[PDB]
RNA sequence: GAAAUUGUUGAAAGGGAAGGGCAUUUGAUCAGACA
RNA sequence: GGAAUACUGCCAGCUGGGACUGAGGACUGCGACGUAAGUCAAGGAUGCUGGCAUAAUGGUUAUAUGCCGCCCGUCUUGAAACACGGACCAAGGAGUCUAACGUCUAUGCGAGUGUUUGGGUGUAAAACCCAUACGCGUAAUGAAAGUGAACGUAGGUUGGGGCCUCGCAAGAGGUGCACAAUCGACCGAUCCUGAUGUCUUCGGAUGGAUUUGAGUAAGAGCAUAGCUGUUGGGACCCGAAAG
RNA sequence: AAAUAUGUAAGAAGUCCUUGUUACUUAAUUGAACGUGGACAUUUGAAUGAAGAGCUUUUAGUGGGCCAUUUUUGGUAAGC
C-alpha cells in the first residue's frame, strides 16, 4: 500500500484534439502538430493549443479590433493571425492594408480587406510564409462577454443579472431588490 | 531494460567508479593500521574501574 | 462480405534475432573428479555399477570402463552429475592416454573392432587392481544402500 | 535582520566574498574535548525508597 | 561533408578524460574518509592520554526507514512522513540532522526506524537501490552520465561523488538528496530481531533512534 | 437518441442511479413553485430576489405599439446608405448635396449617439433624437430634421 | 416443438442435505508437425 | 611485562550447494580487457546431448483427496439471520415522449440570424425555390412622465501568452491580445448645484456624489442538433383509506 | 500558570536617496497617501516536499449513522 498524495490516474484535463470531426480541421492540426514539435517556435505551440478550443473560446475577433491592433507602435506590417473566425465591423471607416490569417472569414471581413489591398490567407498559407511564426501578432476575441457569463456567480450582493426569461417591472424586482419591499440583494 | 547490480557483476562495478581496480590492487579493504602507542592517563582508567 | 476487412495485417516478414553476448567456457569440474577414480553410477542400465573414471571428454561427459571382464561395463560415457567419486584412486600411466573420443561412439548385432579397443585398455589396468588387496571383488560387486545408511554423514 | 543584512553585504563584498545571507537552523554540536583536571567525575547511584511523611 | 571520421575521437577524449577525472576524485575521497576516521581515532586516544575525554561531533546525517503501513495514522505524522517522502512500508530517505528536522523526527518516531548510517551502507544502498528523479520517472542510476546530467551544475559528476555529498552533508546536500528516489527497501532477510516491532528500540522494540544499529537493519532489508 | 442516453447504462443496477436510501419518489418537495416563501425560500432569496411582491403602477390595456421607438446610434448612422453610393459619397464632403437618410423609413424612431462619425455632413430626418447626437451631427455639418 | 417437469437406457457418486473455489490423481474425452 | 582470544565492525577478499526467472529480438550506449586486430559475463540465454511428431504435453469433463466456501435480492449503524419477497419454467414486465428552459459540446452563418404560417414547384407528405413581415440580438435605465453610452490614441497602474529589436549565449528592452486586480470616464435612477434665458412659472446649462442599475467603454448573436440537468404533464412501474 | 492546540512574520508585491501632484492635514512644503528618475540577484534572504500551479461552469448521490483510544456531561449502571 501507498499513502498517495495526488489523485491516481488523473487526466491532464486539456484538449488533445478538437471535438470536431471536420476533416479539414483535423488536417490543419496534423500540420501544426509537426510545426510545434520540430521547430520549437513558441508561436507554433500557442497555435496548436488554440485549434482544439471550443467555439466558446474562439470568440470572434472583428476587423475593428484588428485595425486597432495594427496601431500598436511596431505592428502595422504584421501578418496577423486569428485562430477563431474574423467578423466585419461597420463602425470603423478607415481600414489599413494588411495580410491577416484566420480560420474562417466572414463575408464582410474580406470586403474591408481585399478592397483595402489587404490579404486574407488561410492558416496553412501563413505557415509557409512564417514557418517559425516570424513577425506575427496573435489576437484573441473577448471571452468573458457572452450572455451566459453575466449569470455566473449569481448570489446576494454579487449583483449579477438573475436567470430570467421575461424582463421588466413585475419580474424579480420587488422583495430583496429594494428596501421598500423587505431588503436589497 | 535490466538494472544490473554492482557488488555482483564486477564488470558494472567498473562502468562507474574506475578506482575500483586500485582498491583491489592495493587491497586497501584491509589497510594495515600504522601502530602507535599512547596510553591513557591514570585518572581515566581510575574512574573506569571506580565503584 | 462476411467480415468486411481487417484494415491492417501483421507484416509476414521475419526480423533478425538480436546479437547475443553469451559465449562459452569449459566446465570447472568438481575436484572429486580426477582420472583414475572409482565411481558409483546412479542412473541408466548401469545404475549401481562401480566403475573407473579415465578422461574428461570435450562434450563435458566422462569416460569409464568396468572393465568388461570385471563387471561388464564397456567403454561408455556417464554424466558428471549422475555419479559419485570415492576416496580411493588408482594409477593412470601404464595405460592408454588418448585413443578414445566422441566420434568413437557415433556408429554406422555386436561390432567387432570395438571388442578389441576394450581388451586394449583393459589389461593395462587390470594390472593396477591386483596390486591392492580386495579390489576387483569390490569393483565387481554393485552398489546399494543398506537400511539406516545416512548419505549426508557417510564418507567415501 | 535586513538592515544589518546589507551592512554585511557591503564589507563582505568590499573586503571579500562568502556572503552567507540566509539564516540556518540550529546545528549539531561539533567535536570537543572536556578535561577532568579540576573536574574529576562524580559517581552516582540511584536512591533507596523512604517515606518522610 | 563527411564529419563521420571527424567526430568519434573528439567525444571519447572528452569522455576518457572525464573518467580519469573521476578516478582522481574518488582516490581523494578514499584518503579523505580514511584520514578523517583515523583522526577521530587518535583524538580519542590523545584525550584519554591527556586525562581528558574526546567527545565526537553529533551526527549530521541520519537514515530513516518507515516501518509501519499506511492505515490508521493521525493527520500530523501522516503529513510529516509525506514531507520526508516516506509513503510506503519499508522505504528510506536520508536527512540532515538539524533542529528543524530534529523535530520532524520526534513527530514520526512511532512509525519509522532510523539511526546513523555508515559509509559502507550508503555505498551498497546507492549501488543497489539508487535511483534518481528525472521528470518524475524513477530512473535507475547505472551510469555516472545520468548523475552528471542532473548534478553537474553542483559539482557532482560521479556516483561516489554523490555518496560524498550525502555522508559529508555537503553544501548541496538538499538538491543532491532530493535527487534520490526513496529507497524501495525489502523486509529484513534475517527478520526484525524482536517479537513486536512497534515498541521503541530502547524497549525491545523497533521504532525510533537506534543510532549505529541502523546499519545491521538496512543491509538485511537491502 | 435513446442509445446515447444513460438509462441504457443503468440497466442491471438496482436503483437506476436514483439512490437506495432516499429513492426517487413522486413529489418530495411539492409541485411547481410550492414553498417559495417557506422551505424553498433560500433558493429564491438568492437566484431570484425581488420575486415576491409588487413594485410598479399598473397599466390597464397597455398596447405596446404606443411605445415603438427603435433606437439608432451614430455608431452606425452610415449603414443606411448602399455601397454603390457609399463609394462616391465617401469623397465629396459637400454641404450642398448632403446625403439625406430617412431613418423612420429605415425602421427607427429615436436616434441616440454613441460612436463618432466622419465629418461628411448628412441630413438625417428622424422622429426623436438625443441632445448630444444632434449636438454632434451639427458638429459634422449635418442637420437633424424631424418627421412623424 | 424450448423450459419447467417425467419414463426408459447408459456412466458415476452417496456414514444427519446438496451445490461452489484453488490444486492434483484416476477415468472419459478432445487436441499436437513436412528435404 | 608481553601475547592470544571474545565481542563489534569493514573489505570494490576468495569460494562450494539449492531455487524462480530468459522479458527484449539487426545496429547504435557506457565500459572492461588488448600492443593491435579484436575478445568479453559490458543497453534481458545461449550451447551440447537425448526422448516425442503420437497420444510427450496440454485443454475439457466427471469423480475422489487436502484446505476453503452460510442465501440471494432488500431496508438497515448492523442480515446467514428466529427481519421482508422468493416452490419451479417459459413469455411479458419499469426514467418514456412532449412544452418551455440552464450548462456543455458539435455545426452553419455572423451584427446579424431564423427557407418549411404562407407562396412557388415537383419524379408528390420528400426534394428544391421565394416576397412581406414576425421572433431573438444590436441599449440601457427609471414606478412612471422620461432621458439615453468617447476629456483621453475608448484613459491611468500592476500582471500578462505571443510577436519585434540588441546580443554565440545568460539575459535586456519594446510592444503587449485574452484574462485578473485597481483607479478613472461615459449613460439611466437618485439627491444636490440652478447659468444664458422667460408665456412668473415654464426652461435646466454648468458642476457634482461614503447612493444606485441585470449598462457603455472597437458589438456576439441567432438557428439546428446531442448528452446531462430543470418545471408542467399518468411523468420510472404497480399500490390507498377516501371525494 | 503549563503541555497540546492557536494569530502573524521570514523580502524584488523588497530597502533606501535628491524631489513632482491634491480640493485632504499642518503654524509651516508640516504631514498624509500616490508617483518620475536614481542606488543593491551566488548564500533571493530559515527547514522539508511538490505525478505543477491558479481558475471556472455544470451536475449526482447525501442530509437515519455506528465503533475504538484519549478528553467528557447526564445516569447506580447499561451492548444506555
Ligand atoms: Mg498496489
Ligand atoms: Mg481509489
Ligand atoms: Mg406594503
Ligand atoms: Mg529465513
Ligand atoms: Mg512478530
Ligand atoms: Mg454502482
Ligand atoms: Mg443520478
Ligand atoms: Mg431502491
Ligand atoms: Mg431524496
Ligand atoms: Mg432519509
Ligand atoms: Mg408437432
Ligand atoms: Mg427437459
Ligand atoms: Mg454404488
Ligand atoms: Mg440416516
Ligand atoms: Mg569477525
Ligand atoms: Mg565480504
Ligand atoms: Mg469450514
Ligand atoms: Mg433495525
Ligand atoms: Mg442479505
Ligand atoms: Mg437471531
Ligand atoms: Mg416491509
Ligand atoms: Mg414466502
Ligand atoms: Mg423476458
Ligand atoms: Mg428587439
Ligand atoms: Mg403511475
Ligand atoms: Mg372509491
Ligand atoms: Mg374532501
Ligand atoms: Mg473558463
Ligand atoms: Mg452538486
Ligand atoms: Mg439532490
Ligand atoms: Mg447537492
Ligand atoms: Mg482505531
From Swiss-Prot, chain E:
One of its GO terms (molecular function) is structural constituent of ribosome. InterPro entries: Ribo_uL30_ferredoxin-like_sf (IPR036919), Ribosomal_uL30 (IPR039699), Ribosomal_uL30_CS (IPR018038), Ribosomal_uL30_euk (IPR005998), Ribosomal_uL30_euk_arc (IPR035808), Ribosomal_uL30_ferredoxin-like (IPR016082), Ribosomal_uL30_N_euk (IPR012988). It is found in: Cytoplasm. GO terms for cellular component: cytoplasm; cytosol; cytosolic large ribosomal subunit. The keyword Cell membrane does not apply. Pfam families: Ribosomal_L30, Ribosomal_L30_N. One of its GO terms (biological process) is ribosomal large subunit biogenesis. Keywords: Cytoplasm, Ribonucleoprotein, Ribosomal protein. Component of the large ribosomal subunit (LSU). Mature yeast ribosomes consist of a small (40S) and a large (60S) subunit. The 40S small subunit contains 1 molecule of ribosomal RNA (18S rRNA) and 33 different proteins (encoded by 57 genes). The large 60S subunit contains 3 rRNA molecules (25S, 5.8S and 5S rRNA) and 46 different proteins (encoded by 81 genes). Belongs to the universal ribosomal protein uL30 family. Component of the ribosome, a large ribonucleoprotein complex responsible for the synthesis of proteins in the cell. The small ribosomal subunit (SSU) binds messenger RNAs (mRNAs) and translates the encoded message by selecting cognate aminoacyl-transfer RNA (tRNA) molecules. The large subunit (LSU) contains the ribosomal catalytic site termed the peptidyl transferase center (PTC), which catalyzes the formation of peptide bonds, thereby polymerizing the amino acids delivered by tRNAs into a polypeptide chain. Present with 101000 molecules/cell in log phase SD medium. There are 2 genes for uL30 in yeast. This is Large ribosomal subunit protein uL30A. The lineage of its organism: Eukaryota, Fungi, Dikarya, Ascomycota, Saccharomycotina. The gene is RPL7A.
Amino acid at each position: 500500500g501507498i499513502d498517495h498524495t495526488s489523485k491516481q490516474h488523473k487526466r491532464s484535463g486539456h484538449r488533445t484534439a478538437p471535438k470536431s470531426d471536420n476533416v479539414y480541421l483535423k488536417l490543419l492540426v496534423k500540420l501544426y502538430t509537426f510545426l510545434a514539435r520540430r521547430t520549437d517556435a513558441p508561436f507554433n505551440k500557442v497555435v496548436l493549443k488554440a485549434l482544439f478550443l471550443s467555439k466558446i473560446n474562439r470568440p470572434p475577433v472583428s476587423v475593428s479590433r484588428i485595425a486597432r491592433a495594427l496601431k500598436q507602435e511596431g505592428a502595422a506590417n504584421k501578418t496577423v493571425v486569428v485562430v477563431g473566425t474574423v467578423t466585419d465591423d461597420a463602425r470603423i471607416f478607415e481600414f489599413p492594408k494588411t495580410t491577416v490569417a484566420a480560420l474562417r472569414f466572414t463575408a464582410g471581413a474580406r470586403a474591408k480587406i481585399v478592397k483595402a489591398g489587404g490579404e486574407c490567407i488561410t492558416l496553412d498559407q501563413l505557415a509557409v510564409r512564417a514557418p517559425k511564426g516570424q513577425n506575427t501578432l496573435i489576437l484573441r476575441g473577448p471571452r468573458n462577454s457572452r450572455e451566459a457569463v453575466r449569470h455566473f456567480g449569481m448570489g446576494p450582493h454579487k449583483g449579477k443579472a438573475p436567470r430570467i426569461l421575461s424582463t421588466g417591472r413585475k419580474f424579480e424586482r420587488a422583495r430583496g431588490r429594494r428596501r421598500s419591499k423587505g431588503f436589497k440583494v | 531494460v535490466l538494472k544490473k547490480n554492482p557488488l555482483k557483476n564486477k564488470q558494472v562495478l567498473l562502468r562507474l567508479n574506475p578506482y575500483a581496480k586500485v582498491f583491489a590492487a592495493e587491497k586497501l579493504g584491509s589497510k594495515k593500521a600504522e601502530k602507535t602507542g599512547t596510553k591513557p592517563a591514570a585518572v581515566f582508567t581510575e574512574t573506569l574501574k571506580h565503584d | 462480405s462476411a467480415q468486411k476487412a481487417p484494415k491492417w495485417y501483421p507484416s509476414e516478414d521475419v526480423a533478425a534475432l538480436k546479437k547475443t553476448r553469451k559465449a562459452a567456457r569449459p566446465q570447472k569440474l568438481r575436484a572429486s573428479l580426477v582420472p583414475g577414480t572409482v565411481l558409483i553410477l546412479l542412473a541408466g542400465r548401469f545404475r549401481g555399477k562401480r566403475v573407473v573414471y579415465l578422461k574428461h571428454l570435450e562434450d563435458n561427459t566422462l569416460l569409464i570402463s568396468g572393465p568388461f571382464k570385471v563387471n561388464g561395463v564397456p567403454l561408455r560415457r556417464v554424466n558428471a552429475r549422475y555419479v559419485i567419486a570415492t576416496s580411493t584412486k588408482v594409477s593412470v600411466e601404464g595405460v592408454n592416454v588418448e585413443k578414445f573420443n566422441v566420434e568413437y561412439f557415433a556408429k554406422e548385432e555386436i561390432k567387432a573392432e570395438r571388442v578389441e579397443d576394450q581388451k586394449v585398455v583393459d589389461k593395462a589396468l587390470i594390472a593396477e587392481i591386483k596390486k591392492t588387496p580386495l579390489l576387483k571383488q569390490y569393483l565387481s560387486a554393485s552398489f546399494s544402500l543398506k537400511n539406516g545408511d545416512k548419505p549426508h554423514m557417510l564418507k567415501f | 535582520r535586513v538592515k544589518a543584512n546589507a551592512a554585511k553585504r557591503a564589507e563582505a563584498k568590499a573586503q571579500g566574498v562568502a556572503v552567507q545571507l540566509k539564516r540556518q537552523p540550529a546545528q549539531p554540536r561539533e567535536s570537543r574535548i572536556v578535561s577532568t583536571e579540576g573536574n574529576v567525575p562524580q559517581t552516582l547511584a540511584p536512591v533507596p525508597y523512604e517515606t518522610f511523611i | 561533408a563527411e564529419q563521420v571520421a571527424a567526430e568519434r575521437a573528439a567525444r571519447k577524449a572528452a569522455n576518457k578524460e572525464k573518467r580519469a577525472i573521476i578516478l582522481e576524485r574518488n582516490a581523494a575521497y578514499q584518503k579523505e574518509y580514511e584520514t578523517a576516521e583515523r583522526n577521530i581515532i587518535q583524538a580519542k586516544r590523545d584525550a584519554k592520554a591527556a586525562g581528558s575525554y574526546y567527545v565526537e561531533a553529533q551526527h549530521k546525517l541520519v537514515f530513516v526507514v518507515r516501518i509501519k503501513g499506511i492505515n490508521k495514522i493521525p493527520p500530523k505524522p501522516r503529513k510529516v512522513l509525506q514531507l520526508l517522502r516516506l509513503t510506503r512500508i519499508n522505504s528510506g530517505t536520508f536527512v540532515k540532522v538539524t533542529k528543524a528536522t530534529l523535530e520532524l523526527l520526534k513527530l514520526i518516531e512511532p512509525y519509522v526506524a532510523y539511526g546513523y548510517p555508515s559509509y559502507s551502507t550508503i555505498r551498497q544502498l546507492v549501488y543497489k537501490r539508487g535511483f534518481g528523479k528525472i521528470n518524475k520517472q524513477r530512473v535507475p542510476l547505472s551510469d555516472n552520465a545520468i548523475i552528471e546530467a542532473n548534478l553537474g551544475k553542483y559539482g557532482i559528476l560521479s556516483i561516489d561523488d554523490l555518496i560524498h555529498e550525502i555522508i559529508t552533508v555537503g553544501p548541496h546536500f538538499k538538491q543532491a538528496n532530493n535527487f534520490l528516489w526513496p529507497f524501495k527497501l525489502s523486509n529484513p532477510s534475517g527478520g526484525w530481531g524482536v517479537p513486536r516491532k512497534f515498541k521503541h528500540f530502547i524497549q525491545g522494540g523497533s521504532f525510533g533512534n537506534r543510532e549505529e544499529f541502523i546499519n545491521k537493519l538496512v543491509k538485511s532489508m537491502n | 437518441p435513446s442509445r446515447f442516453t444513460k438509462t441504457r447504462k443503468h440497466r442491471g443496477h438496482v436503483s437506476a442511479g436514483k439512490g437506495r436510501i432516499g429513492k426517487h419518489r413522486k413529489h418530495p418537495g411539492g409541485r411547481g413553485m410550492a414553498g417559495g416563501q417557506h422551505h424553498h425560500r433560500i433558493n429564491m432569496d438568492k437566484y431570484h430576489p425581488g420575486y415576491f411582491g409588487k413594485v410598479g403602477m399598473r397599466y390597464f390595456h397597455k398596447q405596446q405599439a404606443h411605445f415603438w421607438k427603435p433606437v439608432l446610434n451614430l455608431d452606425k448612422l452610415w449603414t443606411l446608405i448602399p455601397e454603390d453610393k457609399r463609394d462616391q459619397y465617401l469623397k465629396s464632403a459637400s454641404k450642398e448635396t448632403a446625403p439625406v437618410i430617412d431613418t423612420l423609413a429605415a425602421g427607427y424612431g429615436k436616434i441616440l449617439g454613441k460612436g463618432r462619425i466622419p465629418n461628411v455632413p448628412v441630413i438625417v430626418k428622424a422622429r426623436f433624437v438625443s441632445k448630444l447626437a444632434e449636438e454632434k451631427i451639427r458638429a459634422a455639418g449635418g442637420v437633424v430634421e424631424l418627421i412623424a
